[PDB]
Amino acid sequence: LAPLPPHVPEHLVFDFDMYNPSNLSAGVQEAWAVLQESNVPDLVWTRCNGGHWIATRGQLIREAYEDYRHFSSECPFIPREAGEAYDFIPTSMDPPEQRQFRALANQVVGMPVVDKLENRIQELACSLIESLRPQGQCNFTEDYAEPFPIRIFMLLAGLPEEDIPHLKYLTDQMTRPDGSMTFAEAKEALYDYLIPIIEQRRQKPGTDAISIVANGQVNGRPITSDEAKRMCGLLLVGGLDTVVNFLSFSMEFLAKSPEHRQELIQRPERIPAACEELLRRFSLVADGRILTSDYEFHGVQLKKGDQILLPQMLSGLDERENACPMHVDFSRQKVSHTTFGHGSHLXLGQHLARLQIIVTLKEWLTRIPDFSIAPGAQIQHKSGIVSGVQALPLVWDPATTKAV
Ligand code: HEM
Ligand SMILES: CC1(C)[C@@H]2CC[C@@]1(C)C(=O)C2
Ligand SMILES: [K+]
């Protein structure tokens, strides 16, 4: 625990560790939801991870994400050393500067590319699941959650599949560090990978995502090599470490919930709505902002330079935004969440993520409608900037399956 700064009142101290929260055994979202128990204030200070604010309620999380003048994304990760090294584009930038970079990123992961990749995405989901179906078991994280989004991203980026273990290791270290590497080290290694590739593709422009970024324009002027690297780095982290984790949370839930599975099997038109309700309940991102000036916010004196965690995961779990928030209800009339962010940094990869999730649900449930967690398995989770499932052993009776 970092020494309590003079400016922080002892009564607001709640020593939440975002990389190892107390009640993790009960599930990731459950462990973060302790921040929203009756007794806990809306804004707390933890002495963990060098010390930082945490907004615990949807209203404050939304407000701070909108007010980029006070809450800057220049230093968006805890611990401070990570936030300081963090320079990815567009996320490390505030408007006005930030927006011009979004359009270039959209050229590579936005709707028109999703429309282009839909065939390959569909084919891969089907191929992987058909492969597993007769086995009556899988390790879902390694057999599907990882390869399905990652092989598609590597194709899009024009990178060889043999590079996956190296790149996934690095992206993991930036989001759920195992202790072997600092954020700054992991970021620099990712940049080290990209530098020669960007140089090659600026000389011989191709069709892949790296070529597109590296040869692109922002607000009508050429992107620099440095800028391209800083955006390509971010795209790799998004591609390798977002949906990959989310799919495992969703599948863990469905493995324990045969009535929910049945609902989507009998009424497939519900699958898009169910996707949204799983995105709310199994929300998994928590980053934040840095104070640009001394600022009083909801009766708390925040100091210039203070870091504030603004967990995107908490907004939709807040009872003030959604009644019985820990309940998954596919008929929920108003699904309120900030799972994909809020304000000007709203996720640009959401068309891709939603497609990947919906395709998974549809293709899995049509072939393997009935499955469970392996008997005696205790599912371990890991918390971080993006939370994850360590392993998800699934089992089913092949006699309940059907080949398409
Ligand atoms: C379930 C899957 C995903 C979730 C929950 C998610 C969540 C988020 C969140 C919360 C933000 C805002 C970060 C902030 O304000 O500091 C964000 C931004 C971003 N995401 Fe996603 N993301 C997902 C998938 C993806 C994918 C597949 C990509 C493709 C590379 C991607 C690329 C990006 C980029 C480039 C930004 C930065 C936009 C900006 O800063 O202007 N994300 N995402
Ligand atoms: C918080 C994010 C999910 C968003 C895209 C990848 C990620 C870890 C970032 O650094 C910005
Ligand atoms: K920084």
Q: What technique determined this structure?
A: X-ray
Cα–Cα distance between 362 and 336 in angstroms, integer?
23
Residue 217: helix, strand or coil by DSSP?
Answer: strand
Element (H, E) at 334: none
Gaps (C–N > 2.5 Å) in the chain: which residues precede them?
none
Distance between Cα 255 and ligand 3 center (Å)? 40
Cα–Cα distance between 94 and 73 in angstroms, integer?
6
How far from the centroid of its chain's Cα atoms is residue 155's Cα? 20
Cα–Cα distance between 182 and 146 in angstroms, integer?
23
Distance between Cα 349 and ligand 1 center (Å)? 6
385 within ligand 2 shell (Cβ under 6 A): yes
Answer for the pair 235, 209: CB distance below 8 angstroms, yes or no.
yes
Ligand 1 nearest atom to the CA of residue 73, by list position: 16
Answer for the pair 329, 276: CB distance below 8 angstroms, yes or no.
no
Given the structure tokens 């799983």, which residue do they identify? 278
Token pair belonging to 369: 């409608």
DSSP secondary structure, 144-161, as one string: IITHHHHHHHHHHHT--G
**CB count in 10 Å sphere of residue 306:** 20
Distance between Cα 373 and ligand 2 center (Å)? 29
Distance between Cα 152 and ligand 3 center (Å)? 29
Domains of the chain: total: 1
Rounded (10°) CA dihedral 263, 267, 269, 275 = 10
Rounded (10°) CA dihedral 336, 341, 306, 72 = -130
Cα–Cα distance between 394 and 193 in angstroms, integer?
35
275 within ligand 1 shell (Cβ under 6 A): no
| Structural domain for 162, as ranges | 1-404
What is the Cβ-side half-sphere exposure of residue 184, based on CA atoms within 13 angstroms? 8
Which residues sit in the known binding site for heme?
347
Distances in Å between the Cα of 52 and the Cα atoms of 18, 46, 252, 290, 339 are 11, 6, 32, 10, 21
Q: What is the DSSP letter of 143?
A: I
Cα–Cα distance between 147 and 127 in angstroms, integer?
11
Sign, CA dihedral 38-44-45-49, equals positive
Q: Residue by residue, what is the 3-state secondary structure of 264-323? A: HHHCHHHHHHHHHHHHHHCCCECCEEEECCCEEECCEEECCCCEEECCHHHHCCCCCCCC
Answer for the pair 71, 345: CB distance below 8 angstroms, yes or no.
no
Answer for the pair 235, 108: CB distance below 8 angstroms, yes or no.
yes
Entry resolution (Å): 1.8
285 within ligand 2 shell (Cβ under 6 A): yes
Residue type, position 87, single letter? D
Residue type, position 161, single letter? E
Cα–Cα distance between 194 and 213 in angstroms, integer?
12
Of 120, 144, 119, 116, nearest to 130 by C-alpha is 144
Which residue's alpha carbon is nearest to atom 7 within ligand 1? 340
Query: Can you say whether residue 158 is alpha, beta or left, with left for phi > 0 and alpha for psi between -120 and 50 degrees?
Result: left
> Ligand nearest 101 Cα, by number?
1
310 within ligand 2 shell (Cβ under 6 A): no
Answer for the pair 102, 348: CB distance below 8 angstroms, yes or no.
yes
Distance between Cα 340 and ligand 1 center (Å)? 6
Which residue's alpha carbon is nearest to atom 2 within ligand 2? 238
Phi and psi dihedrals of 288, rounded to 5?
-165, -155
> Ligand nearest 100 Cα, by number?
1
Cα–Cα distance between 264 and 190 in angstroms, integer?
40
What lies within 8 Å, CB to CB, of 373 at 6+ separation is 252, 255, 256, 379, 392, 393, 394, 395
Ligand 2 nearest atom to the CA of residue 287, by list position: 1
Answer for the pair 311, 342: CB distance below 8 angstroms, yes or no.
no
List alpha helices for 176-216, DSSP H. 183-203, 209-214
DSSP bridge partners of 137:
395
CATH number for the domain including 259? 1.10.630.10
